[PDB]
Design a protein around this nucleic acid. Structure first.
Ligand SMILES: COc1cc([C@@H]2c3cc4c(cc3[C@@H](O[C@@H]3O[C@@H]5CO[C@@H](C)O[C@H]5[C@H](O)[C@H]3O)[C@H]3COC(=O)[C@H]23)OCO4)cc(OC)c1O
Lengths: 211, 505, 52, 83
DNA sequence: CGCGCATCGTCATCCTC
DNA sequence: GAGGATGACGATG
DNA sequence: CGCGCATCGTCATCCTC
DNA sequence: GAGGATGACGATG
């Protein structure tokens, strides 16, 4: 019981996997973001990348896999999952608390939520599940610039210290069809976020206006 | 045969001891190649294919199990493959597999690596240079599962035990050998090859800025980097080796932040400026506490001085026995002599073999010339009659087969290669190329007969250093591209201290 | 004969499989079971124990 | 034709030999022709006519080649005949 | 490697009424 | 200065 | 795939004395 | 006879 009493009033020390930011829960929380990554491999990429931006307005928390759908599920099953409980405990949401005024948003410990996953269909499914989870119980939060997405390239080319990024296969197909001197560049497919290196992560977080 | 019962004495002195011997064989490195059988199987499988492009780790482990006859589970092998590629501070001063992907940073104990299917790998440029391609014939192989399999060791041009360390726990024996610097090893080998006396060395690491102190033989102390920014703040720049940022934080900053059962909260604020390679901790505390820590010693307060010993120098031998080594120079001299014994073997193997290849080319050229002359008539002639005509000329069998037989010592005539050449060889455009090729082979054989085996090692060392220059240049450029430029760059006076008492045992 | 682990490795090597060897080994096992209720015909011979 | 002694390839330039070979009626690789006809949806090609080793210049192998071509003709006839 | 929990559409029961 | 306790590590269950 | 717990010999600290 | 609840299965997180 004494240990449980200590457990409170110290940010969220319940989960070791969480990498809390500096101003999380304190002042200027409206700008403190939070990065959600799928699995655990993407956590390595996010942590390796945060070396350049900082530790004040960014925090990383790894997920597990397919998030439980909440639009049609028993309340008991909702209480059973611990990952959702950790998500609420980190963010600070409340079930029956409407968020209409900006002060209600200021009450929370994090300003925005940036989700990043693989550039495949499975990441798209996970993002959809998260959007459904947020909309099912907080419709008002979807009109204040609260959620955002981080994207990565899916294939790169290389020839004489030159590279061209591509995010979608239709764009890569268009580049192949519209450009001569094709196949001179070395093709390299990217499937998982862990495939990228430290230099690529630094280049990704350098161009924030594109991802 | 049939066994009604089994005595415990025979049960222990005949079966469990086999497990002990196998465990010692698979958990202790060798003084010759500085590797273990698990690492050796992967390194051989990678040598079998060229692999000009990259390759996935999962398919690589599958190929290793396919050819190296590995029978211990792919899961235990993927971790070994990852261990053979890490290059961060504290892991390995030199790597054999290029790090394409994320092979674990210096934050979560190296266990934060991605899934094996997420990462790629490829042999480094230094792999084929340390192991010359002309040494496969020198060593002895095994025939597990009726299959040509990996050898028992390898012959590099540097002692691999002293460059990548060796940490293993076995039965009755253990291994613990720290790292060293490659340039010092090269200088010592070059000094010993002439005949001079080797110099004492010190365990070093790549990309490390902490201080190392030697007090007693086979004992060392390592100190990190601390600075005083202001009369209130303090900065920690570098932690010693065998220390992880997450573990150091959870085991030092957390106990110091809040008051413990018997100590008041010493530190007040701590902030982290972490990167992939360098760390930066900014701690704000009380000025009186800072003066107290200075009076006591900052290294002792924040646990920066770490000791290490060297008393487990146990390795195998060229025969297979174990020895308790005492000094690094002993390992260096033993490796030097073992390497010196094989120059004659390599020279005697390459000689004779090049001569036989040249003789085979000469026989093929003579056969082509005689056919152009029109003496040899092969039209509608029986194969047996043709062989009877060919032997009386002086033409012999395949010399490559002769060397293979001479090596294997420890259906009649053979003239297939003299008739397996297509008709394209019956033109002058190809006859000229064959003539120039045989002349080149004669020149190579003459140069080999003229040169001396020992100087070849120094040549190989020159090439290895020339390649290492480009390798380190690329490694530095990797950080130089990462170099942000504008960033917090706190600078402060540095306190360097040593234990007042050696306290030698 | 051939081992299942090396077989999955070769499949990922040539078939361009990008969904994890663990999800593929279960499929390889499913393509070999021949007990009552599983498959009236199999394509891979059951050498070993493929589940009762 | 080579056994007859009409084709002389001793120290003869590859291109000159091709020029002599084409005028005979010899064509390129039909396997390459089918591959091209399938792919529809560097000059002449006579590599396979010179990639045969000298072992083929004996009657012991000429008889085997003759029987093999006869077997291929029979197989083609059976295919043309069957349904 | 074993159990850890998730989607997604039909449906055979399974517990009330 | 003098003794017991314990986790640290790596290939495998 | 992540955490789950085990051997086995040396030893650097770590908690009493 | 008439309605809601729920786990069963398989390739993938
Ligand atoms: C834990 O960390 C991660 C896990 C995953 C999931 C996963 C998720 C799970 C979970 C299990 C699994 C597991 O699947 C299981 O495999 C088992 C293999 O033996 C057979 C007998 O039975 C299978 C289970 O039917 C299946 O459920 C993983 C296999 O590969 C994956 O992709 C799976 O139980 C709890 O949630 C993805 C990640 O990032 C992408 C992770 O970081």
């Amino acid at each position: 019981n004494k240990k449980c009493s200590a457990v409170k009033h110290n940010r969220i020390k319940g989960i070791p996997k969480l990498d809390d930011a500096n101003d999380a829960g304190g002042r200027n929380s409206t700008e403190c973001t939070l990065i959600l990554t799928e699995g655990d491999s993407a956590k390595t990429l996010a942590v390796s990348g945060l070396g350049v931006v900082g530790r004040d307005k960014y925090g990383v928390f790894p997920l597990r896999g397919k998030i439980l759908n909440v639009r049609e599920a028993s309340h008991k099953q909702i209480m059973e999952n611990a990952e959702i409980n950790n998500i609420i405990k980190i963010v600070g949401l409340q079930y029956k608390k409407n968020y209409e005024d900006e002060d209600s948003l200021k009450t929370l410990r994090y300003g925005k939520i940036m989700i990043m996953t693989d550039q495949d269909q499975d990441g798209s499914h996970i993002k959809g599940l998260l959007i459904n989870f947020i909309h099912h119980n907080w419709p008002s939060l979807l009109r204040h610039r609260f959620l955002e997405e981080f994207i990565t390239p899916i294939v790169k080319v290389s020839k004489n210290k030159q590279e061209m990024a591509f995010y979608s296969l239709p764009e890569f197909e268009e580049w192949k069809s519209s450009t001569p001197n094709h196949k001179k560049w070395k093709v390299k497919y990217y499937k998982g976020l862990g495939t990228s290196t430290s230099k690529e992560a630094k280049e990704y977080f350098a161009d924030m206006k594109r991802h | 045969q049939t066994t009604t019962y089994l005595t415990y004495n025979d049960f222990i002195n005949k079966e469990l001891i086999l497990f002990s011997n196998s465990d010692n064989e698979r958990s202790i490195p060798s003084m010759v190649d500085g590797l273990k059988p698990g690492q050796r199987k992967v390194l051989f499988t990678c040598f079998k294919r060229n692999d000009k492009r990259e390759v996935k780790v999962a398919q690589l482990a599958g190929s290793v199990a396919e050819m190296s006859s590995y029978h211990h589970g792919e899961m235990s092998l993927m971790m070994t493959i990852i261990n053979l590629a890490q290059n961060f501070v504290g892991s390995n001063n030199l790597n054999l597999l290029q790090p394409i992907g994320q092979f674990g940073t210096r934050l979560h104990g190296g266990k934060d690596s991605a899934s094996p299917r997420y990462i790629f790998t490829m042999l480094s440029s230094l792999a084929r240079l340390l192991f010359p391609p002309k040494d496969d014939h020198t060593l002895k192989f095994l025939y597990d599962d009726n299959q040509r399999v990996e050898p028992e060791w390898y012959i590099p041009i540097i002692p691999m035990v002293l460059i990548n360390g060796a940490e293993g726990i076995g039965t009755g024996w253990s291994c613990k050998i720290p790292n060293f610097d490659v340039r010092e090893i090269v200088n010592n080998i070059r000094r010993l090859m002439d005949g001079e006396e080797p110099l004492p060395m010190l365990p070093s690491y790549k990309n490390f800025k902490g201080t190392i102190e030697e007090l007693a033989p086979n004992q060392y102390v390592i100190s990190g980097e601390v600075a005083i920014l202001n009369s209130t703040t303090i900065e920690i720049s570098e932690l010693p080796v065998r220390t992880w940022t997450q573990t150091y934080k959870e085991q030092v900053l957390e106990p110091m932040l809040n008051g413990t059962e018997k100590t008041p909260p010493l530190i007040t604020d701590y902030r982290e400026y972490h990167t992939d390679t360098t760390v930066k901790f900014v701690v704000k505390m009380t000025e009186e506490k800072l003066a107290e820590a200075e009076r006591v010693g900052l290294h002792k307060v924040f646990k920066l001085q770490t000791s290490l010993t060297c008393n487990s120098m146990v390795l195998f031998d060229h025969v297979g026995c174990l020895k308790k080594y005492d000094t690094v120079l002993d390992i260096l001299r033993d490796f030097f002599e073992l390497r010196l014994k094989y120059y004659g073997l390599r020279k005697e193997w390459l000689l004779g073999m090049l001569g036989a290849e040249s003789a085979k080319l000469n026989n093929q050229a003579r056969f082509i010339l005689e056919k152009i002359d029109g003496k040899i008539i092969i039209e509608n002639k029986p194969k047996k009659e043709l062989i009877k005509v060919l032997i009386q000329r002086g033409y012999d069998s395949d010399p490559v087969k002769a060397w293979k037989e001479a090596q294997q010592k420890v259906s009649g005539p053979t003239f297939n290669y003299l008739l397996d050449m297509p008709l394209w060889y019956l033109t002058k455009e190809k006859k000229d190329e064959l003539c120039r090729l045989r002349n080149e082979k004669e020149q190579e054989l003459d140069t080999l007969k003229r040169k001396s085996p020992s100087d070849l090692w120094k040549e190989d060392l020159a090439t290895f250093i020339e390649e290492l220059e480009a390798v380190e240049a690329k490694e530095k450029q990797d950080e130089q591209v990462g170099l942000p430029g504008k960033g917090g760059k706190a600078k402060g006076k540095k306190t360097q201290m040593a234990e007042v008492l050696p306290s030698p045992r």
